[PDB]
Design a protein around this ligand. Structure first.
Ligand code: CHL
Ligand code: CHL
Ligand code: CLA
Ligand code: CLA
Ligand code: CLA
Ligand code: CLA
Ligand code: CLA
Ligand code: CLA
Ligand SMILES: CC1=C[C@H](O)CC(C)(C)[C@H]1/C=C/C(C)=C/C=C/C(C)=C/C=C/C=C(C)/C=C/C=C(C)/C=C/C1=C(C)C[C@H](O)CC1(C)C
Ligand SMILES: CC1=C(/C=C/C(C)=C/C=C/C(C)=C/C=C\C=C(C)\C=C\C=C(C)\C=C\C2=C(C)C[C@@H](O)CC2(C)C)C(C)(C)CCC1
Ligand SMILES: CCCCCCCCCCCCO[C@@H]1O[C@H](CO)[C@@H](O[C@H]2O[C@H](CO)[C@@H](O)[C@H](O)[C@H]2O)[C@H](O)[C@H]1O
Lengths: 194, 165, 217, 210
């Protein structure tokens, strides 16, 4: 059990001890049925892996002064052209949409037909790393924890922008500039009244 | 508006009819002294006439070339053009009262049928039971649906008499 | 046995043990609507949904109204709030209602099928793994599971009290909404004004002096 | 319902009040604690509302008394009901935001103990640190009793706690009523009475306001 999310609480028996990231947190009893827990387990890892790439690229663009994650698609909505690392990319939304759809349907289709393989290997695991189970366990715990953290991070970015309309790095600067003046309670949205 | 009719409020024939009606009542109010009971009665009829012509027009009734209010019975035209208090709402009001009478009477017949002499309870009315059913008839519509859904409202054909065919 | 009318004859259909297991059973069915057990079960579900909707709506009329009366809020009167909200919305009312009926109908159909056969919405493979949680409890109209995030229904020593407070608060909120409609048509003002006006002169400001409720006196 | 102290000498007290809670004088005219699970929750509630009320009344009267004296400091003659609009280092909103976060952690830690006694007596971070096993909800002790008082007559100390709290809870209720009715601070209300008690009763005051 990676730990107890709520000290003094008993872990749900349906949660396997080996289950990576098992902090005994299923208060609504969603993973009680084995089939459901199986699907949710794979989905949780997939969500975390995608979010860990989304947070990375959402911070990178801003840090590299290429804009924020929210304003990245506005080129398409306007007459603007597509750029990447400053380099210009010659494609209209329609091209991108069709290209991504086919690419995603192909790779996602192979993953889907496989049968819920959360941890493949070979091409997905070059550089060894997950060859020994002893290392695998801790490496699987680190992936889920970093993924869960990245999922809470992304939601924070979306929520912060929905309340302030600024980029994640731009907020971190506002808060650091005036922590007691710049915070969720001082946005007129998170905490009503005041 | 509909059917080429015109609001009674804007019909000239509607206005002429009201004047014609009040002029008959006035020609008669003359032969009597002002406080005479006959005079008071003709005045109250004239006031009731003025209120009717005004109330009918305010209700948005449409009038034909005859200058008389016409009723719209199409549910679609009535709802879309403000004419539902003419036939639609009256329909659901009557249907509720008529079903009320029917469901109570059916409940009475069923209750007296399980007695010693049902025929006697039809010539001499069991008033207490009748009053009880009369009050419990307000929720007849829901009771009728619940009977229709339990299959207790109708009788089995095998139990109903018929001619040789 | 608590009675809505001390000394009155309680309907036998409300004295049956299953009927007594129902929350808010004060023996009140003068019209005999729930004599049929199958109908009593449908009407119990209907009463629960009316109670939970009325409590949410009335809270959304009174609470904002009192806060606006104080100043903490500037919400429009309940009978004027639709026009105000649609005025600057992203969608016309018709589009907003069409989307409402689609989303409500879906969740209403699942609840309906659960009444027709309790536990049916747990059909394995019917809801991407969520059907397991879509199965309610042994008591119809009390789904729990995800609908009870804090697990208060898990304390058997408090279950009955909690359900009685829900039914009594629900029946009150249902009558408070009817009161909000009647008072609006008889006063032309809002429920918070009606309260303040009555409290100023209760002996001369009431439904007997509204010139509508009692057209005979 | 035995021979324990009574709020009305000679009355038949409720049996459910047996003298296991501090300040059990048999007072439940509305029979609220008749159900044991409600009484269990009500005992903690009374203790929590009393402990905050005791801190409040102190923090409302002490500053006023210091204000009357020559004591100088930012607050000075700030009326308790005017402290919120006062300008502090941070915006009220921000402070409230922090308060609710900090309290979420402590209340849920206290709530965990109440639902499962002795389930939250250990430091999450510095595991080694902990509270003595012997513990009752509402009485954490250990680092919460850093001078060992609990060791001595604990029952008397708990009765002194409930008595002082009930008086504080009634005091705060006074502050609310007297402030909204007399539109002035409590120590001002007391000075008015001490100047002419006979002509300064709620009866006369409210009569004049009518
Ligand atoms: C129980 C629900 C409900 C009730 C009681 C009302 C009641 C009311 N709405 Mg409202 N609405 C309700 C739902 C909704 N409204 C709207 C959108 C609006 C708008 C945009 C407006 C109103 C308006 C009004 C008021 C004028 C009456 C009217 O237009 O006649 C029709 C009302 C009904 C048919 C409600 C009766 C429902 C029935 C009992 C349920 C079965 C009125 C007091 C108007 C207003 O505020 O005027 C100032 C107005 O302009 N509503 C939406 C979609 C977003 C709803 C969705 O559920
Ligand atoms: C038991 C807790 C508590 C109580 C009894 C009060 C009571 C009061 N606060 Mg207060 N507050 C409390 C907690 C807190 N306040 C504030 C922040 C403020 C501010 C910023 C202000 C008040 C004000 C007031 C007064 C005006 C009430 C009001 O807004 O009425 C109208 C609203 C309703 C009746 C609802 C009032 C006597 C106001 C004041 O001081 O006025 C002179 C004021 O401006 N409070 C915070 C955030 C740190 C609190 C807790 O965290
Ligand atoms: C699922 C992850 C993800 C997604 C959906 C996106 C999506 C996007 N990125 Mg991004 N990025 C990511 C991860 C991601 N990024 C990560 C992890 C990094 C760190 C290196 C970056 C660093 C980055 C930069 C510096 C920039 C973007 C930019 C963009 C936008 C232009 C897309 C483009 O033309 O790329 C180009 C497509 C290719 C180069 C194809 C090659 C991909 C092969 C498979 C490798 C676009 C909306 C640009 C932008 O912000 O627009 C102004 C931009 O400048 N990204
Ligand atoms: C690792 C998670 C994480 C981190 C490090 C931050 C960090 C920050 N957030 Mg944030 N946030 C998060 C998650 C996170 N958030 C989540 C999950 C939500 C959705 C509930 C939000 C919603 C949110 C809002 C609406 C705001 C911030 C803001 C901020 C900044 C000021 C502090 C604050 O108000 O926090 C608040 C976060 C929580 C209380 C949680 C700060 C740099 C504020 C800001 O932009 O200041 C400039 C701002 O207004 N956050
Ligand atoms: C019982 C016999 C009967 C007859 C002869 C009619 C006849 C008529 N109805 Mg109708 N109606 C009836 C019963 C009847 N109704 C009942 C019982 C209801 C209750 C639901 C309605 C509800 C109703 C509505 C809502 C509408 C009509 C309308 C109409 C007129 C055009 C409808 C149509 O296209 O074909 C004849 C219709 C039927 C044979 C049966 C019902 C009417 C259908 C379902 C409505 C479809 C109307 C459609 C939009 C065409 C009009 C387009 C546009 C002008 C709205 C027409 C003269 C339309 C109208 O003119 O409104 C201004 C209208 O929209 N009726
Ligand atoms: C419980 C009373 C009752 C009920 C429920 C019905 C029901 C019905 N009758 Mg009917 N009928 C009744 C009494 C009743 N009748 C009486 C007393 C007579 C003698 C006049 C008739 C003569 C009669 C004929 C000739 C016909 C029907 C027909 C019908 C059927 C078609 C709908 C209809 O009502 O047509 C209309 C029925 C009437 C206009 C008769 C009015 C009878 C009054 C209004 C009912 C009062 C009943 C009683 C006094 C109330 C007792 C209450 C109790 C508490 C004491 C329908 C199922 C028709 C049918 O067979 O269709 C399939 C049909 O042709 N009835
Ligand atoms: C529930 C208990 C409670 C609560 C909620 C408060 C709340 C408050 N107190 Mg305190 N106070 C309390 C108990 C309590 N008090 C007790 C028991 C005492 C006895 C000394 C005091 C003595 C006291 C003084 C002397 C003052 C306050 C002040 C204040 C106000 C601002 C404090 C500040 O500026 O930041 C918090 C400061 C620190 C955390 C340090 C604030 C509303 C100050 C104030 O209102 O000035 C305008 C102030 O002058 N309090
Ligand atoms: C221990 C609590 C307590 C105490 C010590 C006081 C003390 C005082 N109040 Mg008072 N008050 C209280 C609670 C309390 N109040 C409560 C709960 C309310 C309702 C919210 C009020 C509402 C109130 C009003 C409206 C007024 C006062 C006023 C006064 C002052 C004199 C006038 C008066 O006696 O009015 C009568 C007070 C009461 C009838 C409340 C009864 C006292 C409580 C219930 C204690 C029970 C008695 C018990 C033996 C303890 C005695 C106190 C003890 C220290 C000896 C006086 C200094 C008057 C004032 O402001 O003077 C300018 C005034 O007009 N109070
Ligand atoms: C039992 C019995 C038996 C015997 O036998 C007989 C008899 C007597 C008949 C019976 C009785 C009955 C009764 C009494 C009933 C009642 C009911 C009700 C009132 C309901 C409500 C009900 C009600 C309800 C639901 C309500 C709902 C509401 C809501 C949603 C709200 C909404 C809204 C809001 C928020 C605000 C905005 O701005 C507007 C709106 C939009 C408006
Ligand atoms: C429950 C009840 C009773 C009724 C019992 C039974 C079995 C009644 C039978 C009903 C049956 C079989 C009806 C069958 C077909 C009915 C149909 C197709 C409905 C036709 C109605 C139409 C087309 C509507 C026309 C209009 C509407 C919208 C309303 C008005 O606007 C007028 C109009 C014509 C425009 C008992 C016992 C007589 C006792 C009592 C209470
Ligand atoms: C009409 C326009 C709007 C509707 C648009 C609908 C788009 C097409 C249908 C929605 C997409 C269906 O999404 C579908 O999800 C299931 C979930 O298991 C995937 O199913 C995948 O995993 C499961 C096992 O986990 C396998 O049995 C399946 O063979 C495999 O492909 C499908 O690969 C994916 O295509």
């Amino acid at each position: 059990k990676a730990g107890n999310w709520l000290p003094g609480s008993d872990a749900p028996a349906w949660l396997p001890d080996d289950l990576p990231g098992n902090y005994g947190f299923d208060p609504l009893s969603l993973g009680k049925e084995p089939a459901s827990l199986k699907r949710f387990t794979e989905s949780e890892v997939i969500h975390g892996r995608w979010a860990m790439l989304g947070v990375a690229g959402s911070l990178a663009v801003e840090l590299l002064g290429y804009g924020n994650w929210y304003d990245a698609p506005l080129w398409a909505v306007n007459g603007g052209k597509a750029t990447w690392f400053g380099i210009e990319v010659p494609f209209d939304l329609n091209a991108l949409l069709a290209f991504e759809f086919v690419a995603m349907a192909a790779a996602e289709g192979q993953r889907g037909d496989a049968g819920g393989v959360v941890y493949p290997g070979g091409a997905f695991d070059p550089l060894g790393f997950a060859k020994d189970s002893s290392k695998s366990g801790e490496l699987k715990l680190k992936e889920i924890k970093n993924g869960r953290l990245a999922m809470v991070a992304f939601l924070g970015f979306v929520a912060q922008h929905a309340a302030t309309g600024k980029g994640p790095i731009a907020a971190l600067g506002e808060h650091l500039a005036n922590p007691w003046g710049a915070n969720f309670a001082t946005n007129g949205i998170s905490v009503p009244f005041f | 508006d509909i059917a080429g009719l015109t609001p009674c409020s804007e019909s000239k024939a509607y206005a002429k009819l009201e004047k014609k009606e009040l002029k008959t009542l006035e020609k008669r109010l003359k032969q009597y002294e002002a406080d005479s009971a006959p005079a008071v009665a003709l005045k109250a009829t004239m006031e009731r006439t003025k209120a009717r012509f005004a109330n009918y027009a305010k209700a948005g009734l449409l009038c034909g070339n005859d200058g008389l209010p016409h009723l719209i019975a199409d549910p679609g035209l009535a709802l879309k053009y403000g004419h539902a208090g003419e036939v639609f709402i009256p329909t659901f009001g009557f249907l509720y009262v008529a079903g009320y009478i029917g469901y109570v009477g059916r409940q009475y017949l069923i209750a007296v049928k399980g007695e010693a002499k049902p025929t006697d309870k039809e010539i001499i009315i069991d008033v207490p039971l009748a009053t009880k059913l009369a009050w419990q008839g307000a929720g007849w519509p829901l009771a009728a649906v619940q009977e229709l859904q339990r299959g207790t409202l109708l009788e089995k054909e095998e139990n109903i008499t018929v001619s040789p065919r | 046995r608590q009675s809505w009318l001390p000394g009155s004859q309680i309907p036998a259909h409300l004295d049956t043990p299953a009927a007594q297991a129902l929350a808010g059973n004060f023996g009140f069915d003068p019209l005999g609507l729930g004599k049929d057990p199958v109908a009593l079960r449908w009407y119990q579900q209907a009463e629960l949904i009316h109670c939970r909707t009325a409590m949410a709506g009335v809270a959304g009329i009174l609470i904002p109204g009192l806060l606006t009366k104080a100043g903490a809020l500037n919400v429009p009167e309940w009978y004027d709030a639709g026009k105000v909200a649609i005025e600057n919305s992203f969608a016309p009312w018709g589009s907003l209602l069409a989307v409402q009926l689609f989303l409500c109908g879906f969740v209403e159909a699942k609840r309906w099928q659960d009444i027709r056969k309790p536990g049916s919405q747990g059909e394995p493979g019917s809801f991407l793994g969520f059907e397991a949680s879509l199965k309610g409890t042994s008591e119809l109209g009390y789904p729990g599971g995800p609908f009870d995030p804090l697990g208060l229904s898990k304390e058997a020593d408090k279950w009955a009290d909690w359900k009685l407070k829900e039914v009594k608060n629900g029946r009150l909120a249902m009558l408070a909404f009817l009161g909000f409609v009647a008072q609006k048509y008889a006063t032309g003002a809002g429920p918070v004004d009606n309260l303040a006006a009555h409290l100023k002169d209760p002996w001369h400001v009431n439904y007997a002096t509204n010139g509508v409720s009692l057209p005979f006196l | 319902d035995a021979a324990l102290p009574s709020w009305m000498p000679g009355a038949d007290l409720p049996g459910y009040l047996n003298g296991t809670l501090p300040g059990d004088f048999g007072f439940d005219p509305l029979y609220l604690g008749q159900d044991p699970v409600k009484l269990k929750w009500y005992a903690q509630a009374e203790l929590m509302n009393a402990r905050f009320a005791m801190l409040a009344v102190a923090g409302i009267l002490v500053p006023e008394l210091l204000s009357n004296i020559g004591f100088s400091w930012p607050g000075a003659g700030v009326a308790w009901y005017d402290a919120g609009k006062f300008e502090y280092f941070a915006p009220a909103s921000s402070l409230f935001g922090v308060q609710m976060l900090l309290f979420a952690w402590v209340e849920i830690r206290r709530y965990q103990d109440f639902v499962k006694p002795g389930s939250a007596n250990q430091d999450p971070i510095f595991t080694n640190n902990k509270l003595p096993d012997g513990n009752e909800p509402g009485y954490p002790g250990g680092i919460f009793d850093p001078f060992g008082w609990s060791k001595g007559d604990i029952k008397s100390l708990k009765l002194k706690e409930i008595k002082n709290g009930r008086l504080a809870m009634l005091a705060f209720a006074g502050f609310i009523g007297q402030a909204y009715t007399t539109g002035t601070t409590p120590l001002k209300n007391l000075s008015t009475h001490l100047a002419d008690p006979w002509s300064t009763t709620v009866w006369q005051n409210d009569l004049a306001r009518l």
